[PDB]
Assembly symmetry: C3
Homo-oligomer: 210 residues x 3
Amino acid sequence: LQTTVDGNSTAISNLKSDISSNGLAITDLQDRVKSLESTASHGLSFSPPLSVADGVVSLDMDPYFCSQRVSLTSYSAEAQLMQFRWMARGTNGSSDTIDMTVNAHCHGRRTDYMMSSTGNLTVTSNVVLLTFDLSDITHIPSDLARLVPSAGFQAASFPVDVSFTRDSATHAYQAYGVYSSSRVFTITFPTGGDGTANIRSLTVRTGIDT
Amino acid sequence: DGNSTAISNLKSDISSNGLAITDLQDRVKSLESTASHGLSFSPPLSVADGVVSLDMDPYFCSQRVSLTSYSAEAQLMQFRWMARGTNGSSDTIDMTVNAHCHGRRTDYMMSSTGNLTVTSNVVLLTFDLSDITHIPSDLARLVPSAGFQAASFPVDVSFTRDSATHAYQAYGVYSSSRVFTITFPTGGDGTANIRSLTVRTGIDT
Amino acid sequence: DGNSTAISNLKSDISSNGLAITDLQDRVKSLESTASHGLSFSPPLSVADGVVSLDMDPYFCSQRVSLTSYSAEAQLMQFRWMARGTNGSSDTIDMTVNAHCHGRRTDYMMSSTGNLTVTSNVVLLTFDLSDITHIPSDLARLVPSAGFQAASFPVDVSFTRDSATHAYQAYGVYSSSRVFTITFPTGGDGTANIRSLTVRTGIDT
Ligand SMILES: [Cl-]
Ligand SMILES: [Cl-]
Ligand SMILES: [Zn+2]
Ligand SMILES: [Zn+2]
Ligand SMILES: [Zn+2]
Ligand SMILES: [Zn+2]
Ligand SMILES: [Zn+2]
Ligand SMILES: [Zn+2]
Ligand SMILES: [Zn+2]
């Protein structure tokens, strides 16, 4: 009986020792888990144009502007040469309309217009305004987005080159256009004289950022 | 019996350890669920030694804190290029070419002092990179992008014919990455000679 | 013997706790190895309060879900620039300048007021920002990028001399970030006056 009690006491002391070892290991774990819980990269999110899908972070790229070939580079979208007819509308120095043959070269988010006319435009003053509304294109191109300027571009007048024949002589002017809305721009240019007169063989060259 | 008290005390400590273990298990299971553990990066994003970068083509873009336009130096290349009549001419003509490369835009300004014999009212004139002998060091600035190659593109031409100037808004098209052909009116019909050909155009590379 | 049973029971629970601890140590070691810990982000990527962004120059690019071209408003600046003859002229000439700033491109359309006295067959004409009257607020739009400044660039010029028009494909080059000089033929020799000078060029900013 004395040996029972004394032996059990030694066993208890050994158990105490094990419990303290577990106690210490618990504290080390608690410190380690506290440290892990403070990890800065935990909870990261990504704002457009960055995005995550199934743990893969990507840069979302507009193919008319940029692409990747390992590094971020310029546009991958195919260029187009659009060909259509556009009835331009004279105002402010003309009441007439003129049918323009238009080639629109769309490359990246730049669209360059090259236009020439058949027929003529009667003018009454030394300056005329000519309006280009997308609704007046004879057979609207499918890719309409390429003919609409960006919000940034729309905010300013932009240069337009014009040439035409008046009294069997060709005149040419550095002129300007401006968008009155996303679908409509108007150009203003000298007519090469005063009074009622006719100009023909009108060419318009300009370009826009889309 | 003194032993019984010691046993009762040990039980309480074991139970305390158990509770702390359960708390740790819950916290570690929470840590294992952390959404950011699974993260990788797709080009043009890349990671090296824990640093995540945007890899940038210096001909297109750069950083000055924010992502901005190209840092690559522009170049004004000057060289001669033999162009080849390929329809409406079987003649050739040596062009003096200035190529202004700025970012991924390359603008051509060409002129000639020679003569081109043409046989019809339209001529096709071909520009193959192989016909540049004194090549510049960055020949990739003369190669259009895949996207740009997909369409015809505007070319202005001017020349003299029978002592008269002619100028036309004309078009070119790449038949391959190294070759484009311009198509333009010759200013008349039959066999004739045109002089002082100027060509102005540009490409996106 | 009774406390012997109780000691066996305590032993079993202590053992269970130790094994639970070993498993937690393995899981925590694994968590400590997590590759995504300590990720950082290099310009133009940045992080603020755990949100990772692409910092975008609004004159170059923007996002509309995807990374796209500039959002900044275009501007048509109008000002007077007094250009200075720096070879083949010691004269000055006042230019009316429209600068069309769209994204990081600035296109100049200039027309002259008055006559420029030239002395030779080529003139150099200098455009220093200090000579602009009523300097725009966004002066940054008139300063070429470091990349652009590295090369000469095309400039179109036209003017009148002795009642005849002349027009040349010419070139300019920046001597410093604030100053460029254009070089062009004057259409003759000796002392003369040219008028109605127009200049058209563009720069990447
Ligand atoms: Cl006992
Ligand atoms: Cl324990
Ligand atoms: Zn006129
Ligand atoms: Zn973690
Ligand atoms: Zn002709
Ligand atoms: Zn138990
Ligand atoms: Zn286990
Ligand atoms: Zn003077
Ligand atoms: Zn001349």
